[model samples]
Each structure stands twice: as C-alpha cells, then as structure tokens.
Target: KSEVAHRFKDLGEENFKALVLIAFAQYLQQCPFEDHVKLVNEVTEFAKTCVADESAENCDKSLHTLFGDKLCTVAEMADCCAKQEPERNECFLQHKDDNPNLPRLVRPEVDVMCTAFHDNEETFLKKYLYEIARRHPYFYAPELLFFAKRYKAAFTECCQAADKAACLLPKLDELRDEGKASSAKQRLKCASLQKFGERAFKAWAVARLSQRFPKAEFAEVSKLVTDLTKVHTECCHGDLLECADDRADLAKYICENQDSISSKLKECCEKPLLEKSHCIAEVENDEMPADLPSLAADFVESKDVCKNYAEAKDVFLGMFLYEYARRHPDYSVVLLLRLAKTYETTLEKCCAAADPHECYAKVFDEFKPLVEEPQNLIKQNCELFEQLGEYQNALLVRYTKKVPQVSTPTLVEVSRNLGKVGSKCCKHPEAKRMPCAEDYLSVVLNQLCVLHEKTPVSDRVTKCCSLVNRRPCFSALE
Candidate 1:
C-alpha cells in the first residue's frame, strides 16, 4: 500500500480509473488461473471501496494487492519517489537512467550499437533503453519505454535483414527524430508548468487567446482562455491521449464560437480536426479594434514594465506580448515571439541590476534598431513595389544579397513567390498597401525558412532560419 500510494497517488484523480484498470490487466496476465479469480474479486472490492470512500487508501490496497512484492525497482524511480506527492508522481513519470543536463550525445560511428547488441543482446538492449531514456529526460517514462521497445524490435528485424547498417541507420534517425519531437513538446510543457506555474500559464493562454481574436469582446475571449486553461490543466497532468481529445474539443468549441469572435477563422474551422489548430494559428489576426490601447505607452514607454517584471514576470510578459501582437497584426508570429524573447531577456538582466529603470531606458534606446529595421525594410519594399510597377525582382536581389549562402535555384524560387506577393499587395489602395505587403512578405519569409529547415547548408543560414525573427539575422548577415 505504501509503495502503490508513493508511486501513483499523484497521477491524479482523473487518471485513477485507467491506472487501476491497467494494473488489473497487467496483474491478470501475470497471476495463475486460481489466483486470477481471487485477483478479479480483490480488484472489484478495491474499486467499490475507492468509489464509495474517494480515498487514496483504496487505490493503495488495489495497487499493492495487484502488483505484489517490488513496486518500483529502478533507481531513478526510487529517486523520484523521494520528492513530495503530486510533484513526486511527475518526477517519477519523467525519470530517466542517464543525466540529461550534460551535453548532447554523439552518434556512434558505424556499427557500435549493432556490434554491442550482437555480443550480448539482452544486456545491450537494456543499456540502450536506459541510454535513450537519460538522453531524452524530458520525455514521459512510458513514451521513452515505448520508443526503446520499438527500437529493440527493429534491432531484431534489421539483424536478420541483408544490410544491417542501411536498415538500422535510418531507424536510428527515426528514433532520434521521434524522441526529438516529443522532447520539444515535453520540454515546453515541463518548463511552463515548473517555471511559470499555474497563474502565469493562464496569463499566457489569455495573451495567446487575445492575440488570435483581437476583434472579439474581452469577455468572450476570457471564457475561451478559461476553456484553454482547463484543457492544459487536465492534459498536461500526464495523459497524452486525454490531452489530444481535450485539444480537439477545444478546437471544436473555438470553431462553434467563431462567428462571435473573428470571421477570419472560418476557413480554419472548415479544416479537419487534425489540421484545424494549425490552420487557425496560421490565420492572420483580424483588424485591430478601434478602441484598443497603444502597446508603446503600455510597455516601450511605461514605468510599470519593470515593476510588473519584478513581481510577476511570466504574467506581465504574456500580457505584454498579447498587447504587442494585437497592435502589430502585420508582424508574423515568429517576429512577435522574437520581440517577446528580447524583452524578457533584457528585463531579466535589468531588473536584477542596481539601476533597473536606467538599464531599461538604455536598452530600449539600443532596442530601437531591432524594432525599426524590420519596419523600415517592409516600408522600403512597398515603396519599390509602388515605384517599379510589376517588373521588380527586388525580393530576388534582397534575398540573394541578404542570404548569400542560399543556392541560386532556391533564391529564384523564393523570390519568384515573393514577387507574386508583391504584385498582389502593392496594387492595393494606399492605406492597405503597407499592411498587405507586411503580411504577405512575412508569409514568404516564413516559407523560405521552412524550405531550408531540414537540409541546412551553412551555419548562418541554419541559425537565422531557426530564429523567431529571421529578419534581424538575415539583415545582419552581410
């Protein structure tokens, strides 16, 4: 009972049913035929006790009775269990054999893994799983186990195949990539939950929500934000399939309420559930509200930025980004993210200093270039589009000169698409021309970054492409 409660008590009430059911199933598989009937009776008794009393005692009884002797043998699991209850469960679920804080693992050159596997298959498999688990410490323990199991199965299959290297090499990359993708999501989830905690995460949801639906009444947006927050609260607690379902529901809710918010979401709402959120994220913000306040007075020109930064950093940052994004709807999502990151970094340094306001003032002065350069480039591009009718390959010239490392063929393709954007936007009425160009130009730049994402040639190009604001990096390249 102590072992069961210690390990799984914090998996949360939401997961209790599934936990008991899964444990029962595993127990059923392990126990003898006569023991099976006894096992079923005990499980039913525990379920009845649990539902009747709503106590951890019943859960403990069931799990202890079911699992028998050793509950947790892994050193990492034992170490994680030493922490406090709810957090202990989180730690236990995320346990890994290897140290994750260390530098990244170097890929073994040609056959090291396979050679070891051949020498001692079972021992090597155990070592490999632990190694991967440690390397991707952010991953949930079960997810790491699943991937490790898959890799082990692949090893057997590849060993029997013609060329083990050919079969195994790609699988290694596949494993790395699968783990990498999950690790990125898990890292974000962990950081947000652990670093920002609940309040700040809700604030973040509000910020993100507000930006997406700037035209919606704040009251309506707040409700949606609440719904989003609820989804995270339940989902991030450690149930991935539940997480997916909750997100899909939220997407449905958003789609159903799209009419009250922004009509811009209509096309996104039309997309299949899997594609809906991605489509929604890609959709540009609706037109700015006439009564919306200026972000400059709120942050860039305010006394309270540092004050709020000192007290509630994440909340203030989220709220600030929300306002900033709404005010500058023409800016790409990546650009907005970059601006927020810079603000956070600067504030972190300045707020810790003896003279914070002075530091902020100085930084803001220096920061003007980061803000102005992108604005100026967009303005300049629109100016040329206006002056040079349709024949301007200014985009081609700019990209060729700006991102010199890019191949001529890629440059040509990116520029040609950009030219189409220029032609589409520059011909619009004067009032709309700049905003249209800013929006479409941002799209083109985003596409360019995406194009070079996997197959990177130069360090600078890769660095810039990976950035939230590719503009500054690309602009500074020469």
Candidate 2:
C-alpha cells in the first residue's frame, strides 16, 4: 500500500532523499510563501543529514489546518534553542511565534469550548471551562481576563447547583448572549415557510399540531398520517424544513375550509380537529402556478440550450459539457448525455482523422452562454418529451462559469457515478415507460448529479429517493 495513499513517493531512491524533499515542501508551505531562497537553504542543510539513516518509519510531517499548525511549531522547536525554555517550557512554542499565521499560546481548550458550544453540550463545556480555571493557572495568565471572569461566573452559577441539569442550559445560553434566553422551544421555531421540499418539517408539524391543539376534540389524533413514505413532493430547491411562517395565513386557510375538511379529519384521524382545516387545505397557495411540478420536472430541455451551440456546432460542445458537469453535476444527466454525444463526435472528428491529444489541446475554449429560463415554461401543459428537452437546454446553461480542473478522470468518475445512481434510483413503475432502464438512468442522473457536488457518497441514494422508489433508496446507496 502507498504510504500517502495516492502519492507514489520517489520509489527509485536507495536513500531517504525524497522524504527530506517532502518535509521541506511541507515545512516551507507552513511558513511565508516568498521565502524560496531561505526554504531551499534550510532544506538543503536538512537534506545533507539524509546520509545518516533516512527511513520512512517516522518523519516528514505534512500538514493542513489543525495538523498543519502543530507541525509548524514542532519544526521550529527542532531548529530554535531554549536558554530561557524554563519560563517558556516548550521549545516548539517559541518556534510557533516565529512563523507567520501560526500562533500557539492560545490554549487548545478554546477550540474545545467552541466545539462544545456548537454541539450543544452545555455540561461538557462547563466541565472543561471549570478545569481550565481552577487547576491550570498557567492557562490563566496568558488568557484574556474576559475568559477568566466568564468561567468563574459560570462555575458559580451552574457547577455548584443541586439541580445542575436544569441550570446547565440556562447558564450556557447566558454564555452565548449575556441576555436571558427565550424558551428552548422558540429557539427551534422556523421563521418563514418554504415550498417544494419539507419532508422532515412535515413530521415536525405533526408533532407541533399535537403540542398546540392538545385538548381539541380529536386529542389523541396522531394517526391520519397513513403513508410514511409518500407525501406531496413540492418543488423547493433546498431546505427540507416546513415552516408555519404565517400561522395567521394557515389558520385562515383552515377556517375557509372548515365546513368541508374539519369533520372528515375528525372522523379520519385520531389527530386533533384544530388542524382539520390544515389537513385538508391545499399544501400550496391558490395563486401558485398549478403546473409547477411538471415545470420542475422538465426544468431543463435540450432545445433551449442546444440553440446556443447551434452556431458553435460541435466546437465547444465537449468542453462546455465537461465544465457544466463540474459546475452543475447535480442535474447533469441529460446534459451529460448530450455532452457525451458531442464528445464522441469531437473524438471522431479529431482522433479518427488526427491526434486526439493534439486535437483536444487545440480546442478547450471557454465560451459560455447565458440561456435564460423562460417564465412561460411555468404553468404550461407540456408533455414529458417536450419537457425533457429542458434538460438538454439547461445542460448548456450550467457551464457559464469556467473550471479548467475538469480533467478526464474527474469526468469519467462523475459520469459513471451519476449513471449508477440514476440506474439504481430511477425505477419505472410501469412496463410502458418510454425511457428504457439505460435511457431512464441518463435522464434522472443528469438532473440530480449537479444538485449537491459535495454530497457525501452515503447520503446521495436517499437524496435520489423520489426517482429510485424501487427500494428504500438508502439500500441502493449501500
């Protein structure tokens, strides 16, 4: 196995010369950038030491972020001397002060408290702060007095209390904002409503319904939610949370439909009848475009974008598609297919006739067009084939920005992974479906692949759950 995973360290060397070079690069990157002469000088001196015994057993500290900071100090300690290292114990601490953009005196506890604060671990934070304040006066002197006072107050307010659990949260809230906090419940409330996406939020609403309408007629009413897997999937972009942004507006809708939906909900659900109107009321407002979902379904079409390339005919098509894949990989199935086709033609045009490498080198132009999405595409009763054209058109438009980083390997990985996701997730419910499995995969994968470029490999299957309803999409991901 390669020690650096992808990096094949200079394997031919009999001596540990490569290790010194790697360490030099690492040490150099941690310090100032313009010191090529100084870095090379130190590295040359370090390299002369490679004659003794240079094994890959334990050396060459490569770094980034937290690890990088630590390595910087360590490198300096090995170089810098310690006459007054008594008052300032660690030699590495002195070295860290010498480097630009790296500081070490700030305690590691600061990072711990920051993390604890974010994770909502009030008790964990209190304990760490308390330990630092009482036992480590070494921490106290270099530390800001503000931190000292804060920890002392927190210990007195929360640590000594008999009802520690009750006090921990209030004390932590005080730490964040000196003002007293509102209720824990209000902290969780949403301020605005969204459309299209809110599966998780819907469940939250069901729970909130119980909390708010506790004593209503259908008090034991949590059962009307028959389908755990299905709900009206709206077309929101991103934000799976539903919010009752305007309770007044929702209540009005409830009141207006009171005569029709109320009694039925009372009969249909064990859920309280207060949401009777909410249950029956349309998920979207009346003024919302009725054909929005269908529009969303065909949000991108080949015709709309292909026109941009109509003149450039096979010119920048391959490059544009690759660029688009990197930029908008989430929804690039149709686009990628179109690009792949263009790429094949370009290959045939260049390689079948001339050298592929030289041909590609001549061609990687960065011209991108702004293909405006027509609002007319909305509320239109376009059939599926016509709607699918939008995918092609949308594909061309996604390449507006430049990314020369879209290498051949990246393209292949993105293409293959997207195709697999599409094939696995996009299941056809009917035998009569027009797109066969392969065609279906391209269509679905192209659309979804570009949405979240950084989606962890594990979560993508669930993200594509709607199309892949063949199984619990997570199973497909695994």
Candidate 3:
C-alpha cells in the first residue's frame, strides 16, 4: 500500500508539471514573449499537436482522474501549471531542447467561444492581480506594470477595432471642441441646438431610469443624467458631428435606461427636484425641427406633457421666461404676474397663451366659487343706488314746481295732495322725472358726494374717487 501511494504521488507531480506547461504555452500564444520566442513556439507546437490527436483525450481523462475534475480542461490545466513557477521552470528545462523544426501551430480560430473564454481568463487575471496589489502594496513589478499599461492600450485598440465594425469611431477632437463658435448668432444657434438635444435626451433617460430602478438613488441617476446631457450635447453640437446612426443609437440608449436612472435620482433628490431635473433633460433632448418657432412650440408642448406638476412648472417657467425675455420686454413681468396668480387660478387657464376666453373662463371657474358673495354684494349695491337716485330726482322736481294758481289747498288738502304725490312718486320714481339727462347726471354727483362724506379717504377710496370724478359734471340747476 505504501509503494502504491508513493507511485501515485510521483505520477501526480509529473502530470501537474505537464499541465502547467500547456497553460504557459496558451498564455504565450496570446501575449507573445519575444525574448523566449523559440521556446514558446516549440511548446505551442507541441500543445497544438497534442490537442489535434485523438489519443490526447485519454491523457486528459487520466490527468483529470488523478487531479480531480477541477484541473481537466486544457485552459484550466495550463493555468494550474503556470501558477507553480518552480514546477513550470523544471518542465521548461526538460522540454526546451526536444523540439527544433516544429512548424508554428495554426492561430486559434476567432469564434465566440474562444473570445469569451479569453475574455473571462483576462478578467480573472486582472481581478487576481488587483487583489494582490491591494494586499501587498509594494509588490508591483515595473515591467508587469508596463505590460499592464500596454494591455490597456491593446484593449483600447481592440475596442476601436470592434467599434469600426459597428461604425462607432471615436471623435475625440470634435468632442473636445464642442462649444459655440465666435459669431454671436452662430453661438446662439449652437447653444439652442445643444440645449434642445440635451433636454430631450435627459427626458428619455429619466423615463427609462424611473421604469427600471424605481428605488435607485437620485444622486446617482442625476450623475447619469448629467453624463447623458454631455453626450447629447457633444453628439449634436459638439465638433465631432455625429451621424444619424450614432444619434439614433444614443437616443435608444437614453430611452432604454431612463427609468432606472430616474429611480436612482429619486433616491438622492426629492420628487420635485427629480422632476425638475427630468424636465430640463427632456427639453434638452427634445426632437423638434430646427425652425425656431417649431422648436419653441415643441418645448412648450413637452412641458405640458410632463406628468409632474413641479416639472411642468419648471419647464413652463423656463420656456416662458427665456422666450418672453428674448422676444418682448413686457413679457417677463406679465409672465411673472401670471405665474404668481396661478395658485389663485387653475394651471390650465394660467398657461393659456392665445385663447383669452378659455383663459378667463378657467380663471373665472376657479375664482367664481371663492368670490361669488363679494361680487353679488357689489351688484346689489349698484342696483340699490340706481333706484335711490331716481327717487331723489323725483323729490327735487316736486319741490321746484311753481304752479300756484291751481287753487291753494287747505291744510288737510295740502297734506292729502302731498301724501298722494309722494306715494305715486315712490311707486314709479324712475318714470315721472323730466326725462332730463342732466338731472340724472346731477343725481350721480350727489351720490358721489354722499359716498365721499361717508367713506374715509383710504388708498382704495382715493383711487376710486379719482376715477369717478374724472368726467365733467352737468349744471342741472342752470
């Protein structure tokens, strides 16, 4: 039993060495070792020959049976051997002089499986390397570090190559100079274009982000939003002139990730802030035509479409102010007053631009219920004053009558006649008066005097009095 155990141990060690050599050869094939080209080529040739032969399968099975299934695959076995430096060195010493004229092995086919495996291996190596560097801060080899840097460069090259197939060529120079030019009008136009595209992209992104990660941190989502805005700006207005395909691809990505990004943003910011951010993004990314009016209208339309009130308000405020300031000086103050009055009215009416009736209707609908009593009181007072003025005019006419020859009545007759006239006058005060338009004017002046005597001269009173007395009064006595 001891002899058998010793024999098995010896066989395990030898098999381990062979497996390490195979892995080393694979690594060398991937990142060629110029210094050890002869040695690496020879080993690579041997590995290729072994893999091609049907009998090599039996050898792999036997190695697995000895070392367990963990080290069976060619790549795994190679990695295992490569990890044991001393054993790998000894194996190389033994095999280095054996092959000289062996033709170089055919380059491994570039298929998905091979690519995936290679990528996985590379990722694993990087992770391990990073871990080691983290644990042992001083163990970095300068040469290996250079190789790492070279690896990154190679990765970039490969990425560029892959992008070429997808037509995603980088425009670094254009990206760098992606701002307004020297001309003011050109700069303004560029700015508008950039702002429009950014807002649109952000809107698309937020929607996607909200759908995906409903509970995501808002701060993180905001970062993504900012990045997306930059991307849109660079792509659209940046010197790097994106193709239609590129723009479409970017738009698609924003749409796809908007929900998740919004969820993240919601975590860091409140709904109001998040909504504002989202709206700004939407406007930045809006897809309106290049015409100024069309673009402006589309922006406003998008704001109206926003589900969040705060977001809509922000968009409206921004657009209204920007456009108003741009087009008319009176616009800012007018819009500001309108916005201030929005809480006093419904947004539907306040936001109305061209339709005065609809605007007033909505305003009246909301305000009518609140001020109905005060309005009714004013109307009632107006009707009462109108009746009282007619009665006073009748009294003045009755006193001014100079008809003495109609028979001077006795005290009883005079009282009875006066009483009769008064009753009749009271019943139809508005009718019997000398249809003198001048008398009506005098009544209005007397009513104004009564009001002035009764009311204190307050700001409201002063303003009202000035307005009421502006017209010339008629000389009724003349």
Number of backbone collisions per candidate:
0, 29, 35
C-alpha RMSD for every candidate: 13.5, 25.8, 38.0
Better of 1 and 2 by TM-score: 1
Worst 10 residues of 2 by lDDT: 234-243
lDDT of 1 by residue, 293-394 (tens): 655676756877788888977668777667776666555554556577788898888877886767766554555666666667767777777778666376
As a TM-score, model 3 comes out at 0.17
* Candidate 3 colliding pairs, count: 35
Write candidate 3's Cα lDDT for 18-130 as tens digits.
Answer: 22223333223232233223342343343344444635533333222222222222230233355344454334323321112234324333343235435675443343233
Which scores higher on lDDT, 2 or 3?
A: 3
For every model shown, what is its TM-score relative to the native structure?
Answer: 0.45, 0.17, 0.17
Model 3 is weakest, by summed lDDT over 10 consecutive residues, at 176-185
Worst 10 residues of 1 by lDDT: 68-77
Among residues 3 or more apart in sequence or in different chains, the pairs in candidate 1 whose N, CA or C atoms overlap within 3 Å are none
Best by TM-score: 1
Q: Candidate 3: lDDT over CA atoms?
A: 0.32
Please give the lDDT score for candidate 1.
Answer: 0.57
> Which parts of model 1 have CA positions greater than 4 angstroms off?
1-209, 215-248, 255-307, 361-370, 389-398, 401-408, 428-457
